[PDB]
Design a protein around this nucleic acid. Structure first.
Lengths: 101, 147
DNA sequence: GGAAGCCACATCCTCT
DNA sequence: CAGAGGATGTGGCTTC
């Protein structure tokens, strides 16, 4: 469906009230949790036409963002990460405004 | 010494120095297939610093890793030297070895190695999020095209 | 037409 | 497993 980057895909699922089951914001800034890893893993592999895709590999990709300062992990909270880039300047919605919608 | 390692040393544009043969093409930041060594034919006291620099038309001075080594027994053994910077499509880097004696000495190894991101490889008004994420997910596309 | 480059991962793996 | 990172393959895609 065109070029797509993991952090963007996730951003989709987080803007799709339908997915809240397996992945959702946590209310704190841009922090979020993958309530159901294997699922997200499943969709991502699909969006990339990567059957074998799973969370062990998907979490690797997330790690590559640590350096690049796009996403950081939250210490102690399994499956919990956080967008660290300036999503507000990129999209225009403060955490609450977006959280609302 | 050339007998212990046949075809593993090569001559520099300097008659007093030899350096290991490098791969024609190699991946950026990948470890080399052969520890890189600089051999001094004349007498170079053990402990003299030896530095290598890579460069060419595109990159005056490419970024390297571990480009400094200590000379010991006429031989400076580099510990995992790596080329981070790229040489440019269909281009190579010219190494500039430099033994810091007194005075310092310079030896060159022209058109030595080509460094690329893959290296030698096997032949192959107000819009919504959806709209904003889309523009965002393309940026590189249109940004490059239109510019 | 296609080889040569670039890019973001996709795989895989060792510990803790 | 979960989680940090390194080493290196893979497929998309632009450039010559």
């Amino acid at each position: 469906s065109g070029p797509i980057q993991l952090w963007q895909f996730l951003l989709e699922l987080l803007t799709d009230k339908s997915c809240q089951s397996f992945i959702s914001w946590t209310g704190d800034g841009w922090e979020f949790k993958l309530s159901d890893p294997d699922e997200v893993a499943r969709r991502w592999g699909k969006r990339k036409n990567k059957p074998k895709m799973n969370y062990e590999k998907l979490s690797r990709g997330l790690r590559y963002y640590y350096d690049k300062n796009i996403i950081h992990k939250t210490a102690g909270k399994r499956y919990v990460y956080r967008f660290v880039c300036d999503l507000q300047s990129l999209l225009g919605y403060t955490p609450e405004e977006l959280h609302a919608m | 010494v050339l007998a212990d390692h046949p075809g593993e040393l090569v001559r520099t544009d300097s008659p007093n120095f030899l350096c290991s043969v490098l791969p024609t093409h190699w991946r950026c930041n990948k470890t080399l297939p052969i520890a890189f060594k600089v051999v001094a034919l004349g007498d170079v006291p053990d402990g003299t610093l030896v530095t290598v620099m890579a460069g060419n038309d595109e990159n005056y001075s490419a970024e390297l890793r571990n480009a400094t080594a200590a000379m010991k027994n006429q031989v400076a053994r580099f510990n995992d030297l790596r080329f981070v910077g790229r040489s440019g499509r269909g281009k190579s880097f010219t190494l500039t070895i430099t033994v810091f004696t007194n005075p310092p000495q310079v030896a060159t190894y022209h058109r030595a190695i080509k460094i690329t991101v893959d290296g030698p490889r096997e032949p192959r008004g107000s819009l919504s999020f959806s709209e904003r994420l889309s523009e965002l997910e393309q940026l590189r596309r249109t940004a490059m095209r239109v510019s």
